[PDB]
Amino acid sequence: PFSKKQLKVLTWWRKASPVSDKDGIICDGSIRAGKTIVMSFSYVMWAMDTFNEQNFGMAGKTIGALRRNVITPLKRMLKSRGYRVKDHRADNYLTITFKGKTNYFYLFGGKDESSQDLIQGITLAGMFFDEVALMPESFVNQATARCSVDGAKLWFNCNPAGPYHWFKVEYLDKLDEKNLLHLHFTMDDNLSLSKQVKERYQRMYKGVFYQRYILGLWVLAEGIIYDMFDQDEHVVPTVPRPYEKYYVSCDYGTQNPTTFGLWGLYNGVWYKVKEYHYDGRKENKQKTDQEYYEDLMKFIEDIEKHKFKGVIVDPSAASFIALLRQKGIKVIKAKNDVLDGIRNVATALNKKMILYNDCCKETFREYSSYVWDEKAAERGEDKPVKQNDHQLDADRYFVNTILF
Ligand code: NA
């Protein structure tokens, strides 16, 4: 059963609704509020019921994201209601058909050259944006220009970012200038949800990420990024444990410091067993790929190599990655998303999926100083100051690639 606010998303556009004159809808707020899937479900229903033989856009951060977030559950949900769907996977569009009417649903990604090629010359009767805060503004300005058909409606879905983000400033602060409907979603508005489940999700977030992703507020990112890092909780003695599995995580720099960190699984908790930290500036000598490889072997001398599951490493360290693969070391290219990895590291800290041996001294010094970019947040870009973040980037590469 859908909530009252979920049903307002499904029914705002119908003739009987008192808000059907609006040029579109903005649904934002918390995670797991049942807004994305029903918003997309309503979008298609609206488009099938209102036009015939027209084009409709649906957009995500990338197309793969858009498919796993939106299209996959949207398809099964459409099929069970009697909508016949033909997913044209390679061409990235769909045809949907219902009561004799047929429309075409093109899939886009904000950061894709295929998408930015097709968005130049297409005529649309509506546009849908999932994760709209994560997309580039220029793409969204250009996408809305392609909605020239008579009676086109723009639909926007996202999670909160900062107060100076272009979507807050240009769209949410100018609702009635653009004749847009706005509905805000907390976890109260998803009925398939016990408090036990809701209060479990409350425990996962603290600070800015709690205020954004649980409360649904557009709060500014300021000061200490991991302000939930407690040494009462996350630090442990440096003693041996019978670990069942291992990884090494790597932040690479000849210019800057290089860092290895050894991770070990024990009772469903990952432990940063030890750290390596070489800085060429302060040591007054720089290391080659070969020398770091030699250190990496010394660094993993003692662990049983059937338990060692490989090395995680930055995408921009390919001469190191090439060398390691000639030595037959399994290398995982790190996922590399900065804001999503910072979120997951913080969640792994809150949940205590990770702990740290008290020998990880450089990592703790970096926790105390890693801060948000004050000047960038006031433009609307949430990002760290990239200074003393080498152990913390390696740790992020680990948590985001293996845990999440
Ligand atoms: Na670094």
Coordinates of C-alpha atoms and ligand atoms in Angstrom, one line a residue:
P1 CA 0.0 0.0 0.0
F2 CA 1.3 3.4 -1.1
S3 CA 1.4 6.3 1.4
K4 CA -0.8 9.5 1.0
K5 CA 2.2 11.4 -0.4
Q6 CA 3.2 8.5 -2.7
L7 CA -0.4 8.6 -4.0
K8 CA -0.2 12.4 -4.6
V9 CA 2.8 11.6 -6.9
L10 CA 0.7 9.1 -8.8
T11 CA -2.3 11.4 -9.1
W12 CA -1.2 15.1 -9.3
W13 CA -1.4 15.2 -13.1
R14 CA -5.0 13.8 -13.5
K15 CA -7.8 16.1 -14.6
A16 CA -9.6 15.8 -11.2
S17 CA -6.5 17.0 -9.3
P18 CA -6.4 20.7 -8.2
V19 CA -2.7 20.9 -9.0
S20 CA -2.8 19.5 -12.6
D21 CA -2.1 23.0 -14.2
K22 CA 1.5 22.8 -13.0
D23 CA 4.4 22.5 -15.5
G24 CA 6.0 19.6 -13.5
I25 CA 6.9 18.1 -10.1
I26 CA 9.9 18.1 -7.8
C27 CA 10.0 15.1 -5.4
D28 CA 13.0 15.3 -3.0
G29 CA 14.0 14.3 0.6
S30 CA 15.3 11.2 2.4
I31 CA 16.6 7.9 1.1
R32 CA 14.3 4.9 1.1
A33 CA 11.1 7.0 1.1
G34 CA 9.5 5.1 -1.8
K35 CA 9.6 8.2 -4.0
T36 CA 11.9 7.2 -6.9
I37 CA 10.0 4.1 -8.0
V38 CA 6.5 5.6 -7.8
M39 CA 7.6 8.9 -9.4
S40 CA 8.9 6.9 -12.4
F41 CA 5.7 4.7 -12.4
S42 CA 3.6 7.9 -12.4
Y43 CA 5.7 9.5 -15.1
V44 CA 5.1 6.6 -17.6
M45 CA 1.4 6.3 -16.7
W46 CA 1.0 10.1 -17.2
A47 CA 2.9 9.9 -20.6
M48 CA 0.8 6.8 -21.8
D49 CA -2.5 8.5 -20.8
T50 CA -1.7 12.0 -22.2
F51 CA 0.1 11.5 -25.5
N52 CA 0.6 9.1 -28.4
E53 CA 3.6 8.3 -30.6
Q54 CA 5.8 10.8 -28.7
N55 CA 9.3 10.8 -27.2
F56 CA 10.0 10.9 -23.4
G57 CA 13.3 11.3 -21.7
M58 CA 14.4 9.6 -18.5
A59 CA 17.8 10.5 -17.0
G60 CA 20.2 9.3 -14.3
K61 CA 23.8 9.9 -13.2
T62 CA 24.8 7.3 -15.7
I63 CA 22.6 4.9 -17.7
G64 CA 23.6 1.8 -15.7
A65 CA 22.6 3.7 -12.5
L66 CA 19.3 4.7 -14.1
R67 CA 18.6 1.1 -15.0
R68 CA 19.3 -0.4 -11.6
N69 CA 17.6 2.4 -9.6
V70 CA 14.6 3.0 -11.9
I71 CA 14.0 0.9 -15.1
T72 CA 14.4 -2.6 -13.7
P73 CA 11.8 -2.3 -10.9
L74 CA 9.7 0.1 -13.1
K75 CA 9.5 -2.7 -15.8
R76 CA 8.2 -5.5 -13.5
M77 CA 5.8 -3.0 -12.0
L78 CA 4.5 -1.9 -15.4
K79 CA 4.2 -5.5 -16.7
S80 CA 2.0 -6.5 -13.7
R81 CA -0.4 -3.6 -14.4
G82 CA -0.8 -4.6 -18.0
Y83 CA 1.8 -2.3 -19.8
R84 CA 3.6 -4.1 -22.6
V85 CA 7.3 -3.1 -22.6
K86 CA 10.0 -3.7 -25.2
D87 CA 13.4 -2.8 -23.7
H88 CA 15.9 -2.0 -26.5
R89 CA 19.0 -2.5 -24.4
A90 CA 21.7 -1.6 -26.9
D91 CA 20.0 1.6 -28.3
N92 CA 19.0 2.8 -24.7
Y93 CA 15.3 3.4 -25.2
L94 CA 12.0 1.5 -24.6
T95 CA 8.6 1.4 -26.3
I96 CA 5.6 1.1 -23.9
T97 CA 2.1 0.3 -25.1
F98 CA -1.3 0.5 -23.3
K99 CA -4.9 0.5 -24.5
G100 CA -3.7 1.0 -28.1
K101 CA -1.4 3.9 -27.4
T102 CA 2.4 3.7 -28.0
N103 CA 5.2 6.0 -26.7
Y104 CA 9.0 6.0 -26.7
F105 CA 11.1 6.3 -23.6
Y106 CA 14.7 7.3 -24.2
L107 CA 17.4 6.7 -21.5
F108 CA 20.1 9.3 -20.8
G109 CA 23.1 9.9 -18.6
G110 CA 24.4 13.3 -17.6
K111 CA 28.0 12.5 -18.2
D112 CA 27.8 10.4 -21.4
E113 CA 28.9 11.6 -24.9
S114 CA 26.3 9.3 -26.5
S115 CA 23.6 11.1 -24.4
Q116 CA 24.9 14.6 -25.0
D117 CA 24.9 13.8 -28.7
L118 CA 21.3 12.7 -28.8
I119 CA 20.0 15.5 -26.5
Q120 CA 21.0 18.1 -29.1
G121 CA 18.5 17.1 -31.8
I122 CA 15.6 15.4 -30.1
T123 CA 11.9 16.5 -29.6
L124 CA 10.4 15.4 -26.2
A125 CA 7.0 15.5 -24.6
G126 CA 8.4 15.2 -21.1
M127 CA 11.5 14.7 -19.1
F128 CA 12.3 12.7 -15.9
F129 CA 15.5 13.1 -13.8
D130 CA 16.5 10.5 -11.1
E131 CA 19.4 11.8 -8.9
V132 CA 19.1 15.3 -10.4
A133 CA 21.4 16.9 -7.9
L134 CA 24.3 14.6 -9.1
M135 CA 23.8 15.7 -12.8
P136 CA 25.6 18.6 -14.5
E137 CA 23.5 21.7 -14.6
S138 CA 24.3 22.3 -18.3
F139 CA 22.8 18.9 -19.3
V140 CA 19.6 19.6 -17.3
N141 CA 19.2 23.1 -18.9
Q142 CA 19.7 21.5 -22.4
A143 CA 17.3 18.6 -21.6
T144 CA 14.5 21.0 -20.5
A145 CA 14.9 22.9 -23.8
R146 CA 14.0 19.7 -25.8
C147 CA 10.6 19.6 -24.1
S148 CA 8.9 21.7 -26.8
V149 CA 5.7 19.5 -27.3
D150 CA 2.4 21.0 -26.3
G151 CA 1.7 20.2 -22.6
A152 CA 5.2 18.9 -21.7
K153 CA 6.0 18.2 -18.0
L154 CA 9.4 18.1 -16.2
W155 CA 9.8 15.6 -13.4
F156 CA 12.7 15.9 -10.9
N157 CA 13.8 13.4 -8.3
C158 CA 16.8 13.7 -5.9
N159 CA 18.3 13.6 -2.4
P160 CA 19.4 16.8 -0.7
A161 CA 22.8 18.4 -1.3
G162 CA 24.0 21.7 -0.2
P163 CA 21.8 24.9 0.0
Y164 CA 23.9 26.6 -2.7
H165 CA 23.5 23.7 -5.1
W166 CA 22.2 24.8 -8.5
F167 CA 19.0 22.7 -8.1
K168 CA 18.1 24.3 -4.7
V169 CA 18.9 27.9 -5.9
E170 CA 17.6 27.7 -9.5
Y171 CA 14.7 25.3 -9.1
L172 CA 13.5 24.8 -5.5
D173 CA 13.8 28.5 -4.5
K174 CA 11.9 29.4 -7.7
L175 CA 9.0 26.9 -7.6
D176 CA 6.2 29.3 -8.5
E177 CA 8.3 31.1 -11.2
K178 CA 8.4 27.7 -13.0
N179 CA 4.9 26.6 -12.0
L180 CA 6.4 23.4 -10.4
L181 CA 4.8 21.2 -7.7
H182 CA 7.0 20.3 -4.8
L183 CA 6.5 17.3 -2.4
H184 CA 9.0 16.4 0.3
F185 CA 9.6 12.8 1.5
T186 CA 10.8 11.4 4.9
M187 CA 10.8 7.7 5.8
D188 CA 7.3 8.2 7.3
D189 CA 6.0 8.3 3.7
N190 CA 7.1 4.7 2.9
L191 CA 4.5 2.3 4.6
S192 CA 6.5 -0.9 3.9
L193 CA 8.8 0.0 6.8
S194 CA 8.9 -0.9 10.6
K195 CA 10.4 1.4 13.2
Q196 CA 13.0 -1.3 13.9
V197 CA 14.0 -0.9 10.2
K198 CA 13.7 2.9 10.3
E199 CA 15.8 3.3 13.5
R200 CA 18.4 0.9 12.0
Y201 CA 18.7 3.4 9.1
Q202 CA 18.9 6.3 11.6
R203 CA 21.9 4.6 13.2
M204 CA 23.8 4.5 9.9
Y205 CA 24.0 8.3 9.6
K206 CA 25.3 11.0 11.9
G207 CA 26.0 14.7 11.3
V208 CA 25.6 16.3 7.8
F209 CA 24.7 12.9 6.2
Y210 CA 22.0 12.3 8.8
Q211 CA 20.6 15.8 8.2
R212 CA 20.6 15.2 4.4
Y213 CA 19.7 11.6 3.8
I214 CA 17.5 10.9 6.8
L215 CA 15.9 14.2 7.7
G216 CA 15.8 15.3 4.0
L217 CA 17.4 18.8 4.6
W218 CA 19.7 20.7 2.3
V219 CA 22.4 21.4 4.9
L220 CA 25.8 23.0 4.2
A221 CA 28.9 20.8 4.3
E222 CA 31.3 22.5 6.7
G223 CA 34.3 21.6 8.8
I224 CA 35.4 18.1 9.8
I225 CA 34.1 15.5 7.3
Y226 CA 34.3 12.5 9.6
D227 CA 33.1 14.2 12.8
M228 CA 31.7 10.8 13.9
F229 CA 35.2 9.3 14.2
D230 CA 35.6 8.5 17.9
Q231 CA 38.8 7.0 19.2
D232 CA 36.7 5.5 22.1
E233 CA 35.0 3.3 19.5
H234 CA 37.0 2.8 16.3
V235 CA 40.5 2.2 17.6
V236 CA 41.7 -1.2 18.9
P237 CA 44.9 -2.7 20.2
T238 CA 47.5 -3.9 17.8
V239 CA 47.5 -7.6 18.6
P240 CA 47.3 -10.7 16.3
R241 CA 43.9 -12.0 15.2
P242 CA 43.0 -15.1 13.1
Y243 CA 41.9 -13.2 10.0
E244 CA 40.0 -15.2 7.4
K245 CA 40.6 -12.8 4.5
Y246 CA 42.8 -9.9 3.4
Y247 CA 43.1 -6.9 1.1
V248 CA 45.7 -4.1 0.6
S249 CA 44.4 -0.7 -0.3
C250 CA 46.6 1.9 -2.0
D251 CA 46.8 5.7 -2.5
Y252 CA 49.6 6.3 -5.0
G253 CA 51.9 9.3 -5.3
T254 CA 55.5 9.9 -6.2
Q255 CA 54.8 13.7 -6.0
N256 CA 52.6 13.2 -2.9
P257 CA 52.7 10.4 -0.2
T258 CA 52.1 6.7 -1.2
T259 CA 50.1 4.7 1.3
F260 CA 49.3 1.0 1.7
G261 CA 46.8 -0.3 4.3
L262 CA 46.2 -3.9 5.2
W263 CA 42.6 -4.9 5.8
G264 CA 41.6 -8.1 7.6
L265 CA 38.2 -9.8 8.1
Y266 CA 37.3 -11.1 11.6
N267 CA 33.7 -11.7 12.9
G268 CA 32.1 -9.6 10.1
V269 CA 34.4 -6.6 11.0
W270 CA 37.2 -5.3 8.7
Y271 CA 40.3 -4.2 10.6
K272 CA 43.0 -1.9 9.2
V273 CA 45.7 -4.3 10.5
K274 CA 48.6 -1.9 9.7
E275 CA 49.6 1.1 7.6
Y276 CA 52.4 2.1 5.3
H277 CA 53.2 5.8 4.7
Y278 CA 56.0 7.0 2.5
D279 CA 56.4 10.7 1.8
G280 CA 59.2 11.7 -0.7
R281 CA 59.1 15.4 0.3
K282 CA 60.0 14.8 3.9
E283 CA 62.2 11.7 3.3
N284 CA 63.9 13.8 0.6
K285 CA 64.0 10.8 -1.8
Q286 CA 61.3 9.6 -4.2
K287 CA 60.4 6.0 -4.9
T288 CA 59.9 4.2 -8.2
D289 CA 57.1 1.7 -9.1
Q290 CA 59.6 -1.1 -8.5
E291 CA 60.6 0.1 -5.0
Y292 CA 56.9 0.5 -3.9
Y293 CA 56.2 -3.1 -5.3
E294 CA 59.2 -4.3 -3.2
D295 CA 57.7 -2.6 -0.2
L296 CA 54.3 -4.1 -0.9
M297 CA 55.8 -7.6 -0.7
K298 CA 57.6 -6.8 2.6
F299 CA 54.2 -5.4 3.7
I300 CA 52.4 -8.7 3.0
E301 CA 55.3 -11.1 3.8
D302 CA 53.6 -12.9 6.7
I303 CA 50.0 -13.4 5.6
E304 CA 48.9 -16.7 4.0
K305 CA 48.6 -15.9 0.3
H306 CA 45.5 -18.0 -0.3
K307 CA 43.7 -15.6 2.1
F308 CA 45.1 -12.5 0.2
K309 CA 42.4 -11.3 -2.2
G310 CA 44.4 -8.6 -4.1
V311 CA 45.3 -4.9 -4.1
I312 CA 42.9 -1.9 -4.5
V313 CA 44.4 1.1 -6.2
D314 CA 43.6 4.5 -7.8
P315 CA 42.6 4.6 -11.5
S316 CA 45.4 7.2 -12.1
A317 CA 48.3 5.0 -11.1
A318 CA 48.5 2.8 -14.2
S319 CA 52.3 2.3 -14.4
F320 CA 52.0 0.8 -10.8
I321 CA 48.9 -1.3 -11.8
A322 CA 50.8 -2.5 -14.9
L323 CA 53.8 -3.5 -12.8
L324 CA 51.7 -5.4 -10.2
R325 CA 49.9 -7.3 -13.0
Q326 CA 53.2 -8.5 -14.5
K327 CA 54.0 -9.9 -11.0
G328 CA 50.6 -11.7 -11.0
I329 CA 49.2 -9.6 -8.1
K330 CA 45.4 -9.3 -8.5
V331 CA 44.5 -5.7 -8.8
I332 CA 41.0 -4.1 -8.3
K333 CA 40.6 -0.7 -9.9
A334 CA 39.0 1.4 -7.2
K335 CA 35.5 2.6 -7.9
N336 CA 36.7 6.2 -7.2
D337 CA 33.5 8.2 -6.4
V338 CA 34.5 10.8 -3.9
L339 CA 31.2 12.0 -2.3
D340 CA 29.7 8.4 -2.3
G341 CA 32.8 6.9 -0.8
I342 CA 33.0 9.6 1.9
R343 CA 29.3 8.7 2.7
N344 CA 30.1 5.0 2.9
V345 CA 33.2 5.4 5.0
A346 CA 31.1 7.4 7.5
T347 CA 28.4 4.7 7.4
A348 CA 31.0 2.0 7.9
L349 CA 32.2 4.0 10.9
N350 CA 28.7 4.5 12.3
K351 CA 27.8 0.8 11.9
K352 CA 31.3 -0.3 12.8
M353 CA 31.9 -2.5 9.8
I354 CA 35.5 -1.2 10.1
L355 CA 37.9 -0.8 13.0
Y356 CA 41.5 0.4 13.2
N357 CA 44.6 -1.0 14.9
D358 CA 46.2 1.7 17.1
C359 CA 49.4 1.5 14.9
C360 CA 47.5 3.4 12.1
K361 CA 48.8 6.7 13.4
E362 CA 48.9 8.7 10.2
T363 CA 45.3 7.6 9.4
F364 CA 44.2 9.1 12.8
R365 CA 46.1 12.4 12.2
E366 CA 44.3 12.7 8.8
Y367 CA 40.8 12.0 10.4
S368 CA 41.4 15.0 12.7
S369 CA 42.2 17.4 9.8
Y370 CA 40.1 16.2 6.7
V371 CA 37.7 19.0 6.1
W372 CA 35.1 20.1 3.5
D373 CA 36.0 22.8 1.1
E374 CA 34.4 25.9 2.7
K375 CA 34.7 28.0 -0.5
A376 CA 33.4 25.3 -2.8
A377 CA 30.4 24.4 -0.7
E378 CA 29.2 28.1 -0.8
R379 CA 29.2 27.8 -4.7
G380 CA 27.2 24.5 -4.4
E381 CA 30.0 21.8 -4.9
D382 CA 30.5 19.4 -2.0
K383 CA 34.1 18.3 -2.0
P384 CA 37.0 17.7 0.4
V385 CA 40.1 19.9 0.6
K386 CA 42.6 17.5 -0.9
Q387 CA 45.3 17.9 1.8
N388 CA 46.5 15.2 4.2
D389 CA 44.0 12.7 2.8
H390 CA 46.2 9.9 1.5
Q391 CA 45.5 7.2 4.1
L392 CA 41.8 8.4 4.0
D393 CA 41.6 8.1 0.2
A394 CA 43.1 4.6 0.4
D395 CA 40.6 3.7 3.1
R396 CA 37.8 5.1 1.0
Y397 CA 39.0 3.0 -2.0
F398 CA 38.7 0.0 0.2
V399 CA 35.3 0.6 1.8
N400 CA 33.6 1.8 -1.4
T401 CA 34.9 -1.1 -3.6
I402 CA 34.6 -4.1 -1.2
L403 CA 32.0 -3.2 1.5
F404 CA 29.4 -1.2 -0.7
Ligands
NA1 NA 47.0 11.4 -2.0

